[PDB]
Amino acid sequence: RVQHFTGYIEDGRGIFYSLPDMKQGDIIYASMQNTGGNLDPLVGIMAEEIDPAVSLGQVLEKALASENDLISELTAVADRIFLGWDDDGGKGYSASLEFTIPRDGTYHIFAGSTITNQRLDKFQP
Amino acid sequence: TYTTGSFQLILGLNAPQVISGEGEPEGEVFASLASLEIKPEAHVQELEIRLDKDTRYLTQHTRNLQPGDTFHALVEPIGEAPLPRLRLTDSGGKPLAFGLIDQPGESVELNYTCDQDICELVVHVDGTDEAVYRLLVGINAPNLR
Ligand SMILES: [Ca+2]
């Protein structure tokens, strides 16, 4: 059972995908690859659909003002928002995820952009 | 003189086609790298760096690291200069580690380990919050202290 999707991400505004009525014991697989631009894929899975924008924005708020160590603050926030996630598990910066369905019900898949730095003259997430 | 370069080595056991130079891999392995039996050879380098008024950012590129290797770095000021910030990124700018201030707060240290097939690292030292600092770096050298 394989399905394809294509989309566009603008300024860290993610896209939700619905997985209606999965059964306990199923295994979900995900992979997200960049096909244009400077996008850095990120994927997460959760039960109740809530917009991560408000929570992820505080991570950019903290790093922009201090040291804060982004890789620490992002992991802590992600481990709360999502039941499972992956940043760079694939070829390059592409993500890949394996997730065993805990119980019976429906879940949501979140695709979007992570917080990264892409400069060597100065640090700016 | 001696010579330098890369090479390809084909070894065979009771396989007379090897001397032709075209032997394709077959069977079950019989030989292995000898260096893997002992501790990895350490490399250490020390540099003195100065952060002028207009040059408060400094970056350095490292040689490639093989999978399983480890990286260490530390910075200590020459005098009363304040402790700068230290971080490690790859060649694209993706952060990999951040420096931790020690309890005797006179130095900053960093540690990393290699997962990819080839890793190219960049060390960032910045004081953009005649200061002079000592930068000490090592590969497979946990004894930099
Ligand atoms: Ca990624």
Q: Are B122 and B60 in contact (CB under 8 A)?
A: yes
Q: Does A123 touch chain B (CB under 8 A)?
A: yes
Q: What is the 3-state secondary structure (H, E, C) of A33-81?
A: CCCCCCCCEEEEEECCCCCCHHHHHHHHHHHCCCCCCHHHHHHHHHHHH
3-state secondary structure of B12: coil
Beta-carbon neighbour count of residue B60 at 10 Å?
13
Tokens at residue A36, please?
Answer: 């244009």
Whether B76 and B136 have beta carbons less than 8 Å apart is answered as yes
On chain B, the residues whose CB falls within 8 A of the CB of A71 are: 95-98
Helix, strand, or coil here: A5?
coil
Which chain B residues are Cβ-neighbours of A67 within 8 angstroms? 85, 98
Chain B neighbors of A116, CB-CB under 8 A = 93-95
Give binding residues of A as ranges.
40-41, 87-88, 93
Cα–Cα distance, B86 to B75 (Å, whole number): 8
Which chain A residue has its CA at the smallest distance from B55's CA?
Answer: A121
Look at residue B35 and give its three-state secondary structure.
Answer: helix
Say what angle helices A53-63 and A70-81 make with each other, to 10 degrees: 170
Contact A94, A33 (CB under 8 A): yes
Way the structure was solved: cryo-EM
Phi, psi of A53 (to 5 degrees): -60, -45
Specify whether the CB–CB gap between A110 and A82 falls below 8 A. yes
Report which of B108, B33, B107, B121 is spatially closest to residue B70, judged by C-alpha positions.
B121
Ordered strands of the B100-101 beta sheet: B43-51, B131-139, B70-77, B108-113, B100-101
